[PDB]
Design a protein around this ligand. Structure first.
Ligand SMILES: CC(=O)N[C@@H]1[C@@H](O)[C@H](O[C@@H]2O[C@H](CO[C@]3(C(=O)O)C[C@H](O)[C@@H](NC(C)=O)[C@H]([C@H](O)[C@H](O)CO)O3)[C@H](O)[C@H](O)[C@H]2O)[C@@H](CO)O[C@H]1O
Ligand SMILES: CC(=O)N[C@@H]1[C@@H](O)[C@H](O[C@@H]2O[C@H](CO)[C@H](O)[C@H](O)[C@H]2O)[C@@H](CO)O[C@H]1O
Ligand SMILES: CC(=O)N[C@H]1[C@H]([C@H](O)[C@H](O)CO)O[C@@](O)(C(=O)O)C[C@@H]1O
Lengths: 278, 278
């Protein structure tokens, strides 16, 4: 559901399996996208500006802003991705009246509409009351710093908090497919462990840097970070370092990641953490 | 001077401005090299094994071991860099008689000798009493974790300790040329800062990973780490992240490094640290 400041999928409530993305003269249109694929330009960074229920809706990948083309109130006006103008045609009232969510232009009062919905265009239109083509669902994909710190303290495997660099950050929660892809490209899996000179902390540091670089290379938007923790843990046998993430399906679930071999666990391989950072 | 377990230059006391290195059929010889050049193969990792004052002397770069070619005690026998064998021709007694240091093959009883004051070869030889060709000075280039923790607590800019991943590590202290060389190739100097998405912590984490990678690529020996700290600090204007090191010329001197632009500060740009690690 929509929860204000955050990064989201915006999915049509009118047709299944369909969510919004930005296409790759005239500006690129906001278009429909199948949930069978996860291209980065389906991620929307929604940021509060001024008033209650008012937000900008920015494409995290392309950096451009959801914009009602030419400020037009006309039915069928294209919704496009445009450079930031501060204009009211880049501001959106996102509200529900019964758990049904609409996206309304602050400027025109027209609504983001799936028109004629692999078919369908995304346009502004006056209120429609005989179909649900103006209804949208929002899947949150981010956590705030406050959220993540609460999750760490509540996590049975940790029961403790870690310092964050940012004091009020917004974090994108990656999929395991994404984390794995970054890990496969890093070549850590083919880098042997060696005592002190390339040890567990080095794997976890290098991987944390690789996730930060991947976010930098892929997202033109700013104002959010990719969550990627570090933790140091021990047991009777000695010390170890891991990375850590939370799950999109349950943001209270911490998942530990072993950057030596690209594996995941819920329990950090029974290591008890004593230190960490994000 | 020699302080047991550590990384050293091994300089001749007989010919000024010279120290031992490895050469880049036969095995490579240990050769004399000018202190006007600083190839990584002049760095020797010296590790205690067995009896009082007895050590292996390993080339940190090549990973080979200082080896009296054949347990052969003929005068003039090559001192070479060889794979580890567990052999007593790879074990060295390092002791002083006048605060004059010598290097004696635990096995043949002969001494590492600079034969013939370009020129000059490094050989085993029986005791020499009419010249100083068997006398060496050891310049320490490493710190233990105990040393670095004591330095952090004593540093006026810090007056606090940071956690280390290793609990008893051995660290090589890099030169400014090496650091600036790793930084040049990190590409961080051409990476723009962006709010959250590639922020100060990302520069410091990526740089710390870059140092770890460069050490793994260049040092075939194990059993030591390259020192490279992270710190977070603040002043009224907000938070920042830096890397930190200690100086070769005064190991008590902490130096702060700005991985956004490759500069150094003795005082961390008056940011007051509240968090750090190495
Ligand atoms: C000739 C031979 O086979 N000698 C035997 C030694 O190899 C051996 O002792 C080991 O010697 C190692 C050094 O060995 C080589 C090498 O690979 O570097 C073998 C080469 O034949 C020789 N090259 C030449 C042209 O003579 C080379 C060496 O570098 C030169 O002699 C000097 O530049 O030595 C090393 O020291 C090992 O630790 C040592 O155990 C002994 C013991 O098996 O038997 C010898 O017959
Ligand atoms: C038909 C036409 O060209 N009209 C233009 C508009 O383009 C322009 O508005 C800007 O339009 C872009 C899309 O082109 C985007 O929607 C911007 O937010 C918007 O400001 C209009 C007013 O500036 O002038 C007309 O000439
Ligand atoms: C061919 C054309 O009309 N292009 C116009 C577009 C379109 O109206 C919208 O992008 C909706 O498709 O608006 C603008 C723009 O995007 O920069 C300028 C341009 O005049």
């Amino acid at each position: 559901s929509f929860q204000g400041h955050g990064i989201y999928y915006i999915a049509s409530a009118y047709v299944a399996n369909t969510r919004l993305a930005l296409s790759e003269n005239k500006s690129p249109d906001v278009i429909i996208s199948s949930d069978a694929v996860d291209p980065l330009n389906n991620l929307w960074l929604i940021e509060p500006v001024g008033e209650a229920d008012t937000y900008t809706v920015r494409n995290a990948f392309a950096g451009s802003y959801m914009d009602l083309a030419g400020h037009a109130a006309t039915d069928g006006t294209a919704i496009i991705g445009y450079r930031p103008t501060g204009g009211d045609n880049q501001k959106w009232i996102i509200s529900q009246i019964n758990d049904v969510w609409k996206i309304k232009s602050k400027e025109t009062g027209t609504f983001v509409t799936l028109l004629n919905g692999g078919t369908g265009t995304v346009v502004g239109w006056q209120n429609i009351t005989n179909n649900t083509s103006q209804n949208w669902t929002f899947q949150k994909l981010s956590q705030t710093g406050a959220n993540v710190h609460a999750t760490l303290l509540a996590c049975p495997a940790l029961r403790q908090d870690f310092k964050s660099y940012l004091s009020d950050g917004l974090y994108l929660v990656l999929t395991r497919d994404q984390i794995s892809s970054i890990w496969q490209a890093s070549g850590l899996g083919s880098t042997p462990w060696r005592s002190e000179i390339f040890d567990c902390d080095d794997f976890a540091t290098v991987f944390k840097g690789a996730v930060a670089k991947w976010g930098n290379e892929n997202f033109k938007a700013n104002g959010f970070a990719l969550l990627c923790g570090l933790m140091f843990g021990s047991k009777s046998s000695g010390a170890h370092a891991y990375n850590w993430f939370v799950e999109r399906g349950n943001f209270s679930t911490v998942t530990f990641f072993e950057p030596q071999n690209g594996t995941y666990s819920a329990n950090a391989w029974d290591y008890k953490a004593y230190f960490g950072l994000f």
